[PDB]
Write an enzyme that holds these catalytic residues in place. Structure first.
Site, PDB file in Angstrom:
ATOM      1  N   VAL A 285       0.493   5.327   2.086  1.00 52.15           N
ATOM      2  CA  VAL A 285      -0.176   6.053   3.158  1.00 52.15           C
ATOM      3  C   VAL A 285      -0.281   7.524   2.795  1.00 52.15           C
ATOM      4  O   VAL A 285       0.736   8.175   2.572  1.00 52.15           O
ATOM      5  CB  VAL A 285       0.559   5.908   4.498  1.00 52.15           C
ATOM      6  CG1 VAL A 285      -0.140   6.724   5.551  1.00 52.15           C
ATOM      7  CG2 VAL A 285       0.623   4.440   4.910  1.00 52.15           C
TER       8      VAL A 285
ATOM      9  N   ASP B 124       0.182   0.056  15.744  1.00 49.70           N
ATOM     10  CA  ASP B 124       0.964  -1.087  15.279  1.00 49.70           C
ATOM     11  C   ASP B 124       1.067  -1.118  13.765  1.00 49.70           C
ATOM     12  O   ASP B 124       0.124  -1.483  13.055  1.00 49.70           O
ATOM     13  CB  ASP B 124       0.376  -2.399  15.804  1.00 49.70           C
ATOM     14  CG  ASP B 124       1.200  -3.608  15.398  1.00 49.70           C
ATOM     15  OD1 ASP B 124       2.325  -3.427  14.875  1.00 49.70           O
ATOM     16  OD2 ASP B 124       0.740  -4.746  15.633  1.00 49.70           O
TER      17      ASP B 124
ATOM     18  N   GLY C  50       0.754  -1.240   0.000  1.00 48.20           N
ATOM     19  CA  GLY C  50       0.000   0.000   0.000  1.00 48.20           C
ATOM     20  C   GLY C  50       0.788   1.296   0.000  1.00 48.20           C
ATOM     21  O   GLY C  50       2.008   1.312  -0.135  1.00 48.20           O
TER      22      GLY C  50
ATOM     23  N   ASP D 152       4.133  -6.047  20.063  1.00 47.69           N
ATOM     24  CA  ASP D 152       5.198  -5.323  19.367  1.00 47.69           C
ATOM     25  C   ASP D 152       5.279  -3.870  19.845  1.00 47.69           C
ATOM     26  O   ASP D 152       5.418  -2.943  19.059  1.00 47.69           O
ATOM     27  CB  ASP D 152       4.975  -5.357  17.853  1.00 47.69           C
ATOM     28  CG  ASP D 152       6.221  -4.943  17.066  1.00 47.69           C
ATOM     29  OD1 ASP D 152       7.323  -4.943  17.649  1.00 47.69           O
ATOM     30  OD2 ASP D 152       6.102  -4.626  15.862  1.00 47.69           O
TER      31      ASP D 152
ATOM     32  N   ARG E  59       8.972   2.964  17.917  1.00 43.88           N
ATOM     33  CA  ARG E  59       8.616   3.004  16.493  1.00 43.88           C
ATOM     34  C   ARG E  59       7.116   2.809  16.236  1.00 43.88           C
ATOM     35  O   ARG E  59       6.623   3.144  15.157  1.00 43.88           O
ATOM     36  CB  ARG E  59       9.406   1.942  15.726  1.00 43.88           C
ATOM     37  CG  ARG E  59       9.103   0.514  16.173  1.00 43.88           C
ATOM     38  CD  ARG E  59       9.903  -0.525  15.407  1.00 43.88           C
ATOM     39  NE  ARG E  59       9.614  -1.857  15.911  1.00 43.88           N
ATOM     40  CZ  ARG E  59      10.250  -2.417  16.930  1.00 43.88           C
ATOM     41  NH1 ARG E  59      11.231  -1.764  17.546  1.00 43.88           N
ATOM     42  NH2 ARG E  59       9.907  -3.631  17.333  1.00 43.88           N
TER      43      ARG E  59
HETATM   44  N1  LIG Z   1       1.872  10.756  11.173  1.00 40.55           N
HETATM   45  C1  LIG Z   1       1.071   9.700  11.179  1.00 40.55           C
HETATM   46  N2  LIG Z   1      -0.158   9.834  11.806  1.00 40.55           N
HETATM   47  C2  LIG Z   1      -0.932   8.753  11.802  1.00 40.55           C
HETATM   48  C3  LIG Z   1      -0.577   7.542  11.211  1.00 40.55           C
HETATM   49  O1  LIG Z   1      -1.420   6.435  11.246  1.00 40.55           O
HETATM   50  C4  LIG Z   1      -1.259   5.283  10.509  1.00 40.55           C
HETATM   51  C5  LIG Z   1      -1.066   5.387   9.139  1.00 40.55           C
HETATM   52  C6  LIG Z   1      -0.939   4.201   8.427  1.00 40.55           C
HETATM   53  C7  LIG Z   1      -1.043   2.952   9.060  1.00 40.55           C
HETATM   54  C8  LIG Z   1      -1.252   2.859  10.432  1.00 40.55           C
HETATM   55  C9  LIG Z   1      -1.349   1.507  11.076  1.00 40.55           C
HETATM   56  C10 LIG Z   1      -2.763   1.396  11.622  1.00 40.55           C
HETATM   57  N3  LIG Z   1      -2.997   0.138  12.317  1.00 40.55           N
HETATM   58  C11 LIG Z   1      -2.736   0.054  13.682  1.00 40.55           C
HETATM   59  O2  LIG Z   1      -2.278   1.043  14.242  1.00 40.55           O
HETATM   60  C12 LIG Z   1      -3.010  -1.241  14.433  1.00 40.55           C
HETATM   61  C13 LIG Z   1      -3.241  -2.434  13.777  1.00 40.55           C
HETATM   62  C14 LIG Z   1      -3.488  -3.611  14.464  1.00 40.55           C
HETATM   63  C15 LIG Z   1      -3.526  -3.660  15.839  1.00 40.55           C
HETATM   64  C16 LIG Z   1      -3.288  -2.463  16.511  1.00 40.55           C
HETATM   65  O3  LIG Z   1      -3.294  -2.396  17.896  1.00 40.55           O
HETATM   66  C17 LIG Z   1      -3.044  -1.336  18.625  1.00 40.55           C
HETATM   67  F1  LIG Z   1      -3.814  -0.305  18.426  1.00 40.55           F
HETATM   68  F2  LIG Z   1      -3.151  -1.671  19.864  1.00 40.55           F
HETATM   69  F3  LIG Z   1      -1.786  -0.967  18.492  1.00 40.55           F
HETATM   70  C18 LIG Z   1      -3.031  -1.222  15.827  1.00 40.55           C
HETATM   71  C19 LIG Z   1      -1.372   4.029  11.174  1.00 40.55           C
HETATM   72  C20 LIG Z   1       0.679   7.476  10.610  1.00 40.55           C
HETATM   73  N4  LIG Z   1       1.519   8.528  10.567  1.00 40.55           N
END
Ligand SMILES: Nc1ncc(Oc2cccc(CCNC(=O)c3cccc(OC(F)(F)F)c3)c2)cn1
Length: 290
Positions: free
Chosen positions: A23, A167, A21, A149, A153
């Protein structure tokens, strides 16, 4: 359950790009499209040629995020799942991930007068950062949700040092070195993993607490070093064995230059050999937010 209207996503800049993908940073006008002046959102979209397995992974990722409703956990604003390009929409966190953020700062010193280098961050602010992380993990523990995890990061910084846990999975090439990978096996963040995770491959809240200890160590290092940095991956795995043996040969992360002995001893408790002796997040949170 209806889709977020993708036509209401005005593209601003490609924020990042991955294996399956890209973003995008997008603007959303008049965001009364959500139950929870332009809104800044981050959008994750599956590349058109996405394989069937990738698509399934995406749909499951979206189901998992729908659970999460906490100030210090990333929240899913909406999704575009019904039509061709699959999207996940979340809040834009303007200060990026916590590792890069802290890497750009130096530690504050109020006993000195010096030439302005990097922006500073005070020890109290580092604790404010750590506390929020503990609060997020505390919430996940009440959901009996295991992260698996935790690391800087995977944390995001918004306005005024608000932190959210997320994550990104394990494929971003920037951090490819924080993961050990063997053919035929699962990809592992061994420098953040508790010894029983490394030996037996199962994750628990008790192990999240270990990883939190390591993440706290990162924060107080201002992310200047990788954990066990002078050790090879083999050595790090061996060290887990030394914990299992329990003959006094396991080694720990050192006290960071910033870090007061008491805060350090808290990190030590997070690395107890026995799972059930590690402090609960609630107890962690209470310590750090005092
Ligand atoms: N600057 C900036 N701002 C916001 C931004 O946002 C994202 C952009 C693209 C992709 C993601 C990944 C999203 N998917 C998760 O986060 C996820 C998934 C599974 C379990 C999960 O469990 C948890 F929430 F407990 F961690 C979390 C976040 C990135 N850059």
């Amino acid at each position: 359950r209806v889709d977020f209207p993708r036509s209401r996503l005005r593209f601003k800049e490609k924020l990042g790009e991955g294996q399956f993908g890209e973003v995008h940073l997008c603007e959303v006008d008049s965001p009364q499209d959500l139950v929870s002046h332009p809104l800044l959102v981050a959008v994750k979209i599956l590349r058109p040629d996405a394989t069937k397995n990738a698509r399934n992974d995406f749909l499951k990722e979206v189901k998992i995020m729908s659970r999460l409703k906490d100030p210090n956990i990333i929240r899913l604003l909406g999704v575009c799942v019904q039509d061709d390009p699959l999207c996940m929409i979340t809040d834009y966190m303007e200060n990026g991930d916590l590792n890069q953020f802290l890497s750009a700062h130096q530690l504050e010193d109020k006993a000195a007068e010096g030439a302005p280098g990097d922006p500073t961050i005070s020890y109290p602010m580092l604790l404010h950062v750590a506390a929020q992380i503990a609060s997020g993990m505390r919430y996940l523990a009440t959901l009996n949700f295991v992260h698996r995890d935790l690391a800087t990061r995977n944390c995001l910084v918004g306005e005024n040092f608000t932190i959210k846990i997320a994550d990104f999975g394990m494929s971003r090439n920037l951090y490819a070195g924080d993961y050990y990978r063997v053919q035929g096996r699962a990809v592992l963040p061994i420098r953040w993993m508790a010894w029983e995770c490394i030996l037996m491959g199962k994750f628990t809240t008790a192990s999240d607490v270990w990883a939190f200890g390591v993440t706290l160590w990162e924060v107080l290092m201002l992310c200047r070093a990788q954990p066990f940095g002078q050790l090879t991956d083999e050595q790090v795995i061996e060290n887990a064995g030394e914990f299992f043996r329990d003959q006094g040969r396991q080694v720990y992360l050192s006290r960071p230059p910033a870090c007061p002995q008491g805060l350090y001893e808290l990190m030590l408790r997070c690395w107890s050999r026995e799972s059930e002796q590690r402090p609960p997040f609630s107890q962690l949170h209470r310590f750090l937010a005092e």
